[model samples]
Target: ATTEEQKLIEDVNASFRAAMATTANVPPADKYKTFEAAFTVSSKRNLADAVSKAPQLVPKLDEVYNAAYNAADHAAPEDKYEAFVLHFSEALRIIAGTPEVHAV
Candidate 1:
């Protein structure tokens, strides 16, 4: 069951979704034009808040990517394959931005 706080977060995200949808009509080339740039910047601020709150999720990425890139450098053949797969999946899910994780 969602808590009151979770419900509030859902409502806020719904509002953001609606606003972003409306902004979609604006030309892609002029997406950041004028004071409207403030809206785009503020949307990024929301992203920063989420990243700041979850610091550990960072290293999990480094561990995964570094293992792949360093495969020939020193990556153990057996564990490297599994690490590569797991890390790639995790990176995708994170980049896609799970709302429950991003919700503040």
Candidate 2:
């Protein structure tokens, strides 16, 4: 459970950052007008089920994720990512943090 939590958090941020690199200097002309379209595709790859797996520990799992996705749906077109990042950062921070420290 701990490892899942750790990995899920790490991978999300890692992908988020790397996804930006995909949008690199390769912003292929007018075909890529959505601005965040590449990232929307990038974000589709999911494995963030740490909550259900670790219900005993991460109780607010549903609450955390609900707001995060909600922010995305509510966000303006190109601005969708901005709110998504904000919530994920905080949620992942909670998971990675020492709310209950774990030893390797």
Candidate 3:
């Protein structure tokens, strides 16, 4: 990986960790079992492929994390979890929207 890409990854990770800390501070609206089940249903991945395909977006990742975090923060107390989910999904969709990546 290039030094620039590595820096991007580091920044992205830091932003994500900070956002996650905010979520951790908030009480879950749902129980652990429900959250886990929802996560099981919602989670999907193509991380390596997404990263490989869009290194150009690396610097933008911190922006993405911040957007997602802000969306979650702006939601009503009862809706914050869903707000987090939607924003996170949208970020992934933006980064990994290519057909070749999608139809895998």
**Residue lDDT tens for model 2, 27-54:** 3442223424654564445343444554
Worst ten-residue run, lDDT, model 2? 27-36
Model 1 Cα displacement at 43 (Å)?
9.8
Arranged by lDDT with the best first, the candidates are 2, 3, 1
| lDDT (tens digit, per residue) of candidate 3 on 1-104 | 45555544444444444444445533677522244343432222222433665556644554554666588678786776667656764664465442442223
Q: Give the lDDT of residue 46 in candidate 3.
A: 23
lDDT of 3: 0.50
Best by lDDT, which number? 2
Q: Can you list the residue pairs that collide in candidate 1?
A: none
Pitting candidate 1 against candidate 2, the one with the higher lDDT is 2
How many clashes in candidate 2?
Answer: 0
Runs in model 2 with CA error above 4 Å? 24-65, 98-104
Residue 57 displacement (Å), model 3: 4.3
- The per-prediction CA RMSD against the true structure, in angstroms, equals 12.9, 6.7, 9.9
Report lDDT (CA) for all predictions: 0.41, 0.55, 0.50
Expressed as tens digits, the lDDT of each residue in 49-68 for candidate 1 is 43465444435434534543
Full ranking by TM-score: 2, 3, 1
After best superposition, candidate 1 residue 101: deviation in angstroms? 6.3
